[PDB]
């Protein structure tokens, strides 16, 4: 998932740090139904489109059929992460910052899911 020959850091980030997280169809349904249906990966920068989620964040169709929603998550306690650059997989280029949550997922949603434009 990570860019070869780049450093993947392990960090602890404080509470109140926010990330953008693409969520699949049933995942977003669970979120709307009060479940903490958080995946392991997010992004520190805005996620502008589904095409970006696919090509830049390398969120594979095999894992998330539907990437039409994005949520804001916020850390609720100190949170271990991996931080680094996405690597290419399949015919996707990667090349943007992502974080992976390590261990406990001390997250909460901020607001409601947003819609990702296809392009």
């Amino acid at each position: 998932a990570w860019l070869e020959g780049t450093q993947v850091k392990t960090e602890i980030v404080p509470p109140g740090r926010q990330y953008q997280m693409v969520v699949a169809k049933g995942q977003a349904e669970a979120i709307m139904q009060g479940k903490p249906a958080f995946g392991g990966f997010a992004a520190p920068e805005p996620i502008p489109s589904q095409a970006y989620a696919r090509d830049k964040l390398v969120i594979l169709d095999r894992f998330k059929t539907d990437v039409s929603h994005v949520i804001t998550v916020e850390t609720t306690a100190p949170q271990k992460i991996h931080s680094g650059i996405t690597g290419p997989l399949e015919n996707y280029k990667g090349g943007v910052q992502q974080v992976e949550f390590v261990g406990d997922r001390n997250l909460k949603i901020v607001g409601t899911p947003g819609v990702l434009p296809v392009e």
Binding site: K25, G26, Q33, G34, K35, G40, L60
Partner: protein
């Protein structure tokens, strides 16, 4: 068969079957726990109720429900059940799974739908306890048994 499947939020708002997330947002709804799933089987209204919250789907065979049942006040701890359409029987689905030769505890977290060769199969996403890695778990509701597990992300 299962008909008129409705999920009732703690605030009383009713989610109709296949109501989308976007439809909920367009109504000005915030996220809220679902405390009741109700449906018709023949001439009876049947339900399951959990004030701690639950996540319910109708399996595409329209004769089972998969119910992710919250076990405490956090919304995290939960147990997955397959309930018959007539609500007379249910089966607890295993959440200690053999993954790469190791018995792995974990927690079922949410549902997804993928193409299947049988409408009796549904999918529940499983968070492995030791590292929170996600696994797609396909389950045959007609037998109550896990079909397959695949690493997900």
């Amino acid at each position: 068969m299962i008909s008129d499947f409705e999920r009732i939020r703690e605030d009383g708002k009713v989610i109709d079957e296949n109501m989308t997330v976007d439809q909920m947002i367009a109504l000005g709804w915030s996220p809220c726990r679902v405390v009741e799933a109700r449906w018709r089987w023949q001439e009876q209204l049947l339900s399951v109720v959990n004030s701690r919250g639950l996540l319910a789907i109708v399996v595409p065979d329209r004769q089972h429900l998969a119910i992710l049942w919250n076990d405490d006040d956090t919304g995290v701890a939960a147990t997955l059940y397959v309930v018959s359409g007539d609500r007379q029987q249910q089966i607890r689905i295993a959440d200690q799974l053999l993954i790469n030769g190791q018995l792995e505890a974990g927690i079922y977290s949410w549902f997804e739908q993928f193409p299947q060769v049988s409408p009796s199969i549904f999918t529940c996403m499983f968070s492995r306890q030791r590292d929170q890695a996600m696994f797609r778990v396909d389950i045959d509701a007609s037998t109550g048994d896990i079909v397959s597990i695949q690493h997900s992300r």
